[PDB]
Amino acid sequence: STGSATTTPIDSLDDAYITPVQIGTPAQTLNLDFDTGSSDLWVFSSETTASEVDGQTIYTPSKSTTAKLLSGATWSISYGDGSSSSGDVYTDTVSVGGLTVTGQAVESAKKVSSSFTEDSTIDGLLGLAFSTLNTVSPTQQKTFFDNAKASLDSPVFTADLGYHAPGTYNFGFIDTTAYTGSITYTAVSTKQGFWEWTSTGYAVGSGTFKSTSIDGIADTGTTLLYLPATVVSAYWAQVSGAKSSSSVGGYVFPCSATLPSFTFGVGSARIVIPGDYIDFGPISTGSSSCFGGIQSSAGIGINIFGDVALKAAFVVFNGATTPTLGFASK
């Protein structure tokens, strides 16, 4: 089997991407944030505290003839950005772009934190990291990809995120028309439950490539690119007027600037992030100070290849017995 679904930016900045997901019988379609940095499929639901719902589409398990309460099961998750949610668990039929899993754990939110409430466009998350990070207790549950794997033509999914445009998540096959040149594969460590890999270095603009190992995670659920302070300082030094602002919470730059590109290494290959991808616009409405898309990972504890990086590539998440990551230009 295979699946193919379009993923759409939630706003003009590409702050996140939503992908339609069918849950239950008859289908209830919810727009979920596919997140390769976490491993819970959770949804706004009929059980969500009413004051914490503001425009989201909800899953109502009582209206699904295939929903079954997973007795005794609860979940609770906290994300790197400080947001959180928690609730109980159903199993139900879940389909993504024509690919169907029966008995998928659907985590029903009873509580969500303010940032979720305030984002009317995201109805929940669909985790695509390794199932070892799944928070369901007392019986840990599998991700959608893990459940689908054996049935897929090939045990892979691909992320093809657009810049200010729709893109695609494919399951079970590699669309050879979706990228240029070849796919370069690189080793993955699953020890922290993430799609963790090591980049071979970076360049700023038309500058020389610096060979240096940068360990990080491929995370579709993080907006920006978070790298070591040394790397990030080197990038923003090439932008007149750029500075790190503690009051704003990172590097800002004059909105009048032309940003240089940023290149990262995947083995001997190179992925180029155009300068425009690194612009996240005014820090507040009307401001001429703009927020940078490359930020320091210092104090996160991990480097994150988020959407800013991933949307410059066609990315293969290879879930073979020994997982690997593949990157191609596009």
Asked if 158 contacts 145 with a C-beta cutoff of 8 angstroms, the reply is no
Residue in the structure block whose two tokens are 């073979």: 320
CA distance 70 to 83: 25
Phi and psi of 145, rounded to 5°?
A: -65, -45
CA distance 267 to 272: 14
CA distance 190 to 172: 20
Domain boundaries, the chain: 5-174, 175-330
* CATH match of 175-330 with 3.40.50.300: no
CA distance 320 to 329: 22
In single-letter form, the type of residue at position 60 comes to: T
Tell me, letter by letter, the H, E, C secondary structure of the chain. CCEEEEEEECCCCCCCEEEEEEECCCCEEEEEEEECCCCCEEECECCCCHHHCCCCCCECHHHCCCCEEEEEEEEEEECCCCCEEEEEEEEEEEEECCEEEEEEEEEEEEEECHHHHCCCCCCEEEECCCHHHCCCECCCCCCHHHHHHHHCCCCEEEEECCCCCCEEEEECCCCCCCCCCCCEEEECECCCCCCEEEEEEEEECCCCCEEEEEEEEECCCCCCEEECHHHHHHHHCCCCCCEEECCCCEEEEECCCCCCCEEEEECCEEEEECHHHHEEEECCCCCCEEEECEEECCCCCCEEECHHHHCCCEEEEECCCCCEEEEECC
CA distance 223 to 276: 14
Closest C-alpha to 9, from 312, 311, 255, 262: 311
Annotate 287-316 with b (16+ C-beta within 10 A) or e (fewer): eebbbbbbbbbeeeeebbbbbbbbbbbbbb
Catalytic residue, chosen from 38, 45, 95, 199, is: 199
In single-letter form, the type of residue at position 312 comes to: A
| Residue 156 in tokens | 């892979």
Q: 189: which strand partners?
A: 196
Do domains 5-174 and 175-330 share one topology? The answer is yes
5-174 topology per CATH: Cathepsin D, subunit A; domain 1 (2.40.70)
Asked if 185 contacts 320 with a C-beta cutoff of 8 angstroms, the reply is no
CA distance 196 to 139: 25
Q: Which distant-in-sequence residues (6+ apart) come within 8 Å of 188 by Cβ? A: 195, 196, 197, 318, 323, 324, 325
First-to-final CA distance of the chain: 25
Query: Is 54 an annotated catalytic residue?
Result: no
Asked if 168 contacts 4 with a C-beta cutoff of 8 angstroms, the reply is yes
Residue in the structure block whose two tokens are 């730059």: 253
Catalytic residue, chosen from 35, 40, 119, 219, is: 35
Sheet holding 225-227, edge to edge: 269-273, 262-266, 196-204, 210-218, 303-305, 225-227, 294-296
Distances in Å between the alpha carbon of 2 and those of 29, 143, 150, 156, 157?
19, 16, 11, 10, 9
Query: Is 35 an annotated catalytic residue?
Result: yes
Asked if 126 contacts 34 with a C-beta cutoff of 8 angstroms, the reply is yes
